[PDB]
Write a protein that holds these residues in place. Structure first.
Motif, PDB file in Angstrom:
ATOM      1  N   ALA A   4      -6.214   5.240   4.419  1.00 57.98           N
ATOM      2  CA  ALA A   4      -5.575   4.907   3.417  1.00 57.98           C
ATOM      3  C   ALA A   4      -4.783   6.075   2.743  1.00 57.98           C
ATOM      4  CB  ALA A   4      -6.474   4.271   2.379  1.00 57.98           C
ATOM      5  N   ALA A  39       0.630  -1.217   0.070  1.00 58.15           N
ATOM      6  CA  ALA A  39       0.062  -0.054   0.034  1.00 58.15           C
ATOM      7  C   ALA A  39       0.880   1.265   0.067  1.00 58.15           C
ATOM      8  CB  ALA A  39      -0.905   0.037   1.267  1.00 58.15           C
ATOM      9  N   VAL A  45      -6.752   5.466  -5.534  1.00 56.20           N
ATOM     10  CA  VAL A  45      -6.960   4.171  -4.532  1.00 56.20           C
ATOM     11  C   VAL A  45      -7.694   3.015  -5.539  1.00 56.20           C
ATOM     12  CG1 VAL A  45      -8.312   3.655  -2.342  1.00 56.20           C
ATOM     13  CG2 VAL A  45      -7.401   6.071  -2.707  1.00 56.20           C
ATOM     14  N   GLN A  90      -2.977  -0.826  -2.824  1.00 55.65           N
ATOM     15  CA  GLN A  90      -3.963  -0.014  -2.617  1.00 55.65           C
ATOM     16  C   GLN A  90      -3.899   1.314  -3.173  1.00 55.65           C
ATOM     17  OE1 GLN A  90      -4.394   1.271   1.663  1.00 55.65           O
ATOM     18  NE2 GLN A  90      -6.635   0.904   1.661  1.00 55.65           N
TER      19      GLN A  90
END
Ligand SMILES: Nc1ncnc2c1ncn2[C@@H]1O[C@H](COP(=O)(O)OP(=O)(O)O)[C@@H](O)[C@H]1O
Ligand SMILES: Nc1ncnc2c1ncn2[C@@H]1O[C@H](COP(=O)(O)OP(=O)(O)O)[C@@H](O)[C@H]1O
Ligand SMILES: Nc1ncnc2c1ncn2[C@@H]1O[C@H](COP(=O)(O)OP(=O)(O)O)[C@@H](O)[C@H]1O
Ligand SMILES: Nc1ncnc2c1ncn2[C@@H]1O[C@H](COP(=O)(O)OP(=O)(O)O)[C@@H](O)[C@H]1O
Ligand SMILES: [Mg+2]
Ligand SMILES: [Mg+2]
Ligand SMILES: [Mg+2]
Ligand SMILES: [Mg+2]
Lengths: 483, 483, 483, 482
Positions: free
Chosen positions: B192, B1, B165, B153
């Motif tokens: 995130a 991520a 994303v 991610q």
């Protein structure tokens, strides 16, 4: 769709000279050449043949949702729908700026006695109607979501503020209560323009008459062109009320609203609309359109349409081995089984293809078609029996028959092929071993030596020497294992 | 991520040409067999079971948390994920202008005369919101949390100023309301991305209709790929408006945002969507795939899925006097006690193994499995027996039933196992043996002969080599003891 | 829809440093010479007296819309617009951070030894809002459209990916409502940028608060400098709501958007903001700049602005029998007939010549001014009687009237002035002369000397010496005329 | 201002384990407590040579951004700090599982082991501070800047409490007692994000129902203070009188904690000067009276006045700026203003704003007298009331304020900007005195370049005293020739 701004064209017809509503539509097209516009099919290449069977299963199960071959009836349907959509705007012209002075001058001249007669106000009324009666699975909703979809949807006009909602399609409810056919209209209009007609007009408690009168107040501000009511069989003779009440509701709906309402239903629903001369006269505004399943022979000679259809869909098959030439035996048994209804032939394609690529064989056979017919067409045999018998007295009794939950069956077949794969080649070495004693020996001797000679040496020792106990196998196995 | 600089290449299909955000995704060609590469399985060593019951207990305890067997259905789910992530974004190409500009240009072309008939088909490609439905404990969350893990991610782009994303996983909390789903969507997005939005958006003055638009703005800003609204079963339907209004919330949410969305629920939660999906409409969306437990026999043949799963779990147990093979009666009791669901399978196997270790008799059979089921698996009895009954209405009644605090019961039983202090003969065998190397000799040469006549002869005859290999020490034990 | 690429120029102010939104704006150092750069006027030639009557009338028709005089109020308004636009950007610096991070870091520091004191205020700069209040016709719109045209509308940053919309303008319509302003925001934004915000976020179902939040975040996604709302008087006092609700909505709009917002209002519109203007707090803003009509009587002396304006306008006349120097009585009388409202100043001046071109002698006299006032100034009779009365309540309540439809009156006057068959001695003297330039001597010499024998003398001189200019001929032409 | 909480310990024994008190800025001593309030304008040396419009625009912002903390702000800051940090000790969430302790005490008190116990339920009353002073003395700018050191809102992570440290409420020009309870909700849904106005502040509720609703909200959010400003603006006939306005600020003893603060003028203290009831509750933490600065408190002039005058003198934007302040100008300020804050700065601003318009560009005592007699006309009786020293007159004229001086500043700025138009070529028109000269110039300007129209006509009228308009033209053209 979205608010496509208007670009005006001058239609050659004199009656539509000044209307922005008629001149903002796509131009008139030749009815002979308008059939070819609906044609669509998937694209196939030679590279996709050598691919994993899951992707092939996806791309062959997408066939019924993206394959469409125009027929003879599509041209007549398109012509009728075009005339209906462009003939209900003549009395609803917006540009009447110079009406007051003209009418007042005529009034003065006829009052002084100079003029013999004058017509002050005339606007024309009554809404045309048309019905498309046919059996289920005959493409009444697949072919009407394309003819009606070559047009745009909600169109904004720069000079005025009126948005021209070209069409609106609603489906009847399962219970069929008339308070939901008058309530689906508000949601179907909200999902197009993006307003809240439901909260303002639907959740409020108004009677059927009041809620029907409010429809013509929002079908006049936004110049609705067409209103199609589908699945009328569900509303027909369900827990809705009396047949007289149903017929009078439809008659009053056609009278009040000024748009060319169209009705679609199964031949079971013909009887209610032929109840009285008033309803038959109002519904058959442009006559009637009836849809007949394709016959294998037009008049003695084989049907050219049948050959063209089951060649243009024949060439869409995706298999490792596919013969271009289609045998006449397959065609004859296919007309014997499917009886020409358009929904069953494509399902036969997809089901037979899935079963073939799941059973290993890479060709489709008439025996496979018969097997699928007996396997996964059980609910529709009464309908197909009625079609093949040729006795129309009780066809309408079984005309409502649909294959229930066929999509979940397709997903189950996809799951079956995905979970069965093509084979398990990694466990073939274990499949060589047939005795549990040898399985035990391999299990304990797995870490001792490499798996290259674990299977062959043990198999040879157990085969060339027929019988022994488990304990005495190991010394001979190791004696063979050193050399 | 983490932040990966975008690198471009060529796709297999030209349909995704030049899209930067699709191209920045991991390639699709190298994942020929993703099921094999996703097979994580803890492997025991030859001599990890060395007088240390704590190590064996920890290894067995790690199994429910670190066991994953990919079935053929997970390949289909992975294919659907890939299709939904790579085919639903083609509209939002930042290189081209917009869909609206293309539609208006086509309208201008058809009005002028260059283009014959433009198809205003509301071009949205697939754009299908899959509805993943299965019984609780089937492994849906543990499958979507691992198949959607090879995708980073957040892939970064330097040319533009937009962060991609790729996927956002939203978990609906217990006793949840209809506002906290948007609230924790915002929370997960901030986690995130690192930019807070709840301070300026999550304020109680705004209503739920405003939160939807504020969500849509952010969704279109970052060009997020998938949205997963997990655990719809855990929300509260009492605090919210009800089942009829949450459906409106869901349909507005899927319609306004424009990104593909997947919903995870239980057959009890199907009752919310029964009013919509059961209606016959292929354009209504809400496509579904059904999570069914794997069955022993389909059309009279034993499924290899159960055999492979049972074998794979069988080779990974640590028992001193275990039986190498799994009996047919044992598998029959397994299916009669689990019925296909997998969460009960792994917990039942682990609990049975640890109980057999604890009580002194180590061989799992019908009796011991029945005892452990009657002792510990009584709360989960209703749904397990209900699925054997097979009535669809009964399954949804207690579908939500999950064993409570079973991890706390696991740690309590792990503490309880330490209470034993009696000595078993393998402890004496491993304690009377001096060195580390020769320990596995007892383990792999216990079946053929008893230790009393085993250890003296072999310990006397092992003097051929002072540094003999544990791998090479097999032949002497058998050949010198029958003499 | 201008599309200019940004270039960064350094600014001398310390607080402005390193900010990439304020450096791309036109430099502040040029304001000294840009303060009075808005001067504009029509050009008249002495040859335009001898040209045709209709084209002279057309030339006079363009006096109102191409003549501009900078007054003392334009200087102050320009300075305040510059300060507001360039000082509402200091907070939003995308290179160092936002306010919340700074506040949190300062609080963290003051909770420890460093940063002994902190000031937990906000760099809001009061969110400057100006309520430009003045009587209608004072010239507010046609000054805010000239001091806001020097700035480029859309400054585009290429290192970043944001368009710095320096100013955006919202106009009002008849019988407006609160939601119409919100939709006009997106309409103007789409007209300026060229995006499609209106169609996907200007839906009819959205409420005000949802629309307010959408506006707040969209106007921050694009760097916006100023939000100007013009003609707030046209908002309806009945359909939108009472006086309190409009005030509450405007307060909410100012508070939530964040950028400086300018308001243009009439004295009746001041009644809406009487509550907040009376509240003697400048933290919220709503400072008011009071427009006033041009008042001659200033501290016991005629305003030099009035004399400069009237002489500049009087030099812009095109009359054959024009008076050279304005008299005190003739300027005074149209002062009391003008009341300082400058809209009915240029209108009277342009109407006087058009009427006098047909009424007889070509001279602007007091009587024709009086008859124009009694004839074509009927709607604003009570306007000006309230203004001369001096009562604040009467002038406050009696506003907004704007003398409708001057264009039709003017064009009808041109069509009527076209049809004059008679030629005055001025016009018929032309045909006796030959060259167009040589009538300049006639014009210089008609009034002081008798012309009947003068024009033969002009012919004599020019014929005797053709190849010389007017200036060289002039002394000898005079000496022939008198001596 | 949603600042997350960071806890620091304090030296006081009574604030041991209190989240609300420990999540506040630390205790600050008497020395540097006043240095944090000071603010002044920069006004670099490059601003002296600028355009007159921008210089007037800068001058018209001196009162907005100039604050000089005196010796009477330190005491107010200290009392506000004590009041804020002493009303949280009874409201702290520092409560363990008190049920077991209370049950143990109950069981022990009835068996004779423990003679007595204490089952506490409620503690402390609302401290009230009555800060009253003459209007124009600066009781709001010296309060906003004191309160601007504390964050308004603080969010606690472990709990779910938003500690709204303060809340300021203003009274309308003609308002009842029912418009003080609406302002509470209308300011609390602005300090936070909420909708209390449309939920609680309805029309159906009476005064007492809303006054009881305010307590639930003031305890849901640990409201540390409540400042009600300009009690003077309330109307005594739309409210009930001086015994339903005296009882309303005494019945605000039912509000739990929230030590209120009341600010008024010495003519609005006649509401509270009817009994000891609000002379005890209202003066429960003192009663600070603002006093205008006196030039000579002792024989030596005080430092406050001279420092304030000098630090205001240094902000002159004038080309002919006097280097040092003179004694006469200072005495003129003290005589004309009498120490009122709002008058000293206003005299200075208007004086140096009129200096631009008149072009003198220097501040003189005569200019101060002129502007005082011209503009500050309505607030004269307050000035003579202060000068006489009789308390009755001072209390009678303590609501006198300049009505709408912002507008007057606007016309002054407009007058300054109107002067800016000066053009050298129009000095020809200034030289063009005779009407016949104007007639000749307007005809002859287009014929020949305007450079030599001036000297030619000037020579024509200089050499020859009088002549008819016609015969002047040949001679003027002859001069143009040579
Ligand atoms: N002319 C055609 N060519 C190919 N497929 C067709 C044709 N007409 C109908 N179909 C197929 O029939 C299927 C079902 O049609 P359906 O919507 O059920 O019609 P109806 O609602 O009138 O029964 C569709 O999936 C479509 O693929
Ligand atoms: N591929 C797999 N192999 C082995 N066990 C699995 C697999 N998938 C899921 N499980 C089991 O399922 C359990 C978790 O189920 P979960 O994802 O919580 O179901 P649900 O999503 O219905 O709540 C785990 O304990 C795990 O052992
Ligand atoms: N400062 C000015 N200079 C030149 N013309 C002006 C000026 N102010 C107003 N006008 C004239 O007044 C006319 C109407 O002005 P308008 O836009 O109606 O002002 P408002 O909108 O404030 O009523 C315009 O045609 C314009 O030519
Ligand atoms: N200590 C001070 N130093 C500098 N200026 C002050 C001071 N106190 C008040 N002022 C000025 O007085 C002006 C108005 O004071 P304000 O507090 O509004 O009066 P009141 O207390 O009557 O409400 C403010 O603009 C401020 O500039
Ligand atoms: Mg159908
Ligand atoms: Mg789960
Ligand atoms: Mg205007
Ligand atoms: Mg005050």
């Amino acid at each position: 769709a979205t608010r496509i701004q208007a670009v005006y064209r001058d239609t050659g017809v004199e009656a539509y000279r000044d209307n922005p509503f008629i001149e903002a539509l796509p131009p008139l097209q030749e009815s002979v050449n308008s059939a070819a516009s609906l044609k669509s099919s998937l694209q196939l290449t030679s590279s996709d043949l050598q691919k994993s069977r899951v992707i092939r299963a996806h791309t062959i199960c997408r066939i019924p949702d993206d394959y469409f071959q125009p027929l003879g009836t599509h041209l007549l349907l398109s012509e009728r729908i075009s005339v209906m959509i462009r003939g209900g705007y003549v009395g609803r012209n917006p540009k009447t700026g110079d009406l007051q002075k003209h009418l007042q001058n005529g009034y003065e001249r006829v009052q002084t006695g100079e003029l013999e007669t004058f017509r002050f106000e005339e606007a024309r009324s009554t809404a045309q109607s048309l019905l498309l009666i046919g059996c289920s699975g005959s493409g009444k909703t697949t072919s009407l979501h394309r003819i009606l979809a070559t047009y745009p949807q909600v169109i904004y006009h720069r000079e005025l503020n009126v948005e021209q909602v070209v069409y609106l399609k609603i489906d009847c409810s399962h219970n069929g209560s008339l308070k939901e056919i008058c309530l689906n209209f508000f949601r179907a209009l909200d999902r197009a323009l993006g307003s809240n007609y439901e909260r303002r007009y639907g959740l409020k408690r108004h009677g059927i008459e009041t809620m029907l009168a409010l429809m013509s107040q929002i079908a006049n501000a936004h110049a609705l062109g067409l209103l199609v009511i589908d699945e009328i069989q569900h509303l027909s003779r369900s827990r809705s009320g009396g047949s007289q009440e149903m017929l009078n509701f439809f008659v009053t709906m056609v009278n009040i609203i000024g748009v060319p309402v169209m009705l679609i239903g199964t031949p079971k629903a013909r009887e209610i609309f032929e109840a009285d001369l008033r309803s038959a006269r109002r519904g058959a505004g442009f006559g009637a359109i009836f849809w007949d399943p394709i016959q294998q022979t037009q008049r003695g000679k084989p049907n050219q349409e049948w050959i063209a259809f089951t060649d243009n869909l024949w060439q869409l098959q995706l298999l490792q081995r596919k013969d271009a030439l289609l045998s006449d035996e397959v065609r004859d048994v296919w007309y014997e089984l499917s009886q020409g209804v358009m929904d069953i032939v494509v399902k036969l394609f997809v089901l037979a293809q899935l079963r073939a690529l799941a059973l290993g064989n890479e060709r489709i056979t008439a025996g496979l078609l018969r097997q699928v017919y007996q396997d996964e067409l059980k609910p529709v045999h009464p309908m197909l029996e009625a079609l093949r018998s040729g006795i129309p007295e009780r066809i309408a009794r079984y005309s409502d028959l649909v294959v229930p939950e066929i999509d979940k069956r397709l997903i189950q077949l996809q799951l079956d092929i995905a979970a069965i794969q093509e084979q398990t080649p990694e466990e073939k070495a274990l499949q060589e071993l047939d005795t549990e004693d040898q399985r035990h020996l391999y299990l304990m001797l797995k870490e001792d030596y490499d798996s290259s000679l674990l299977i062959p040496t043990i198999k040879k020792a157990f085969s060339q020497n027929p019988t022994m106990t488990r304990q005495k196998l190991l010394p001979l196995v190791l004696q063979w294992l050193m050399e």
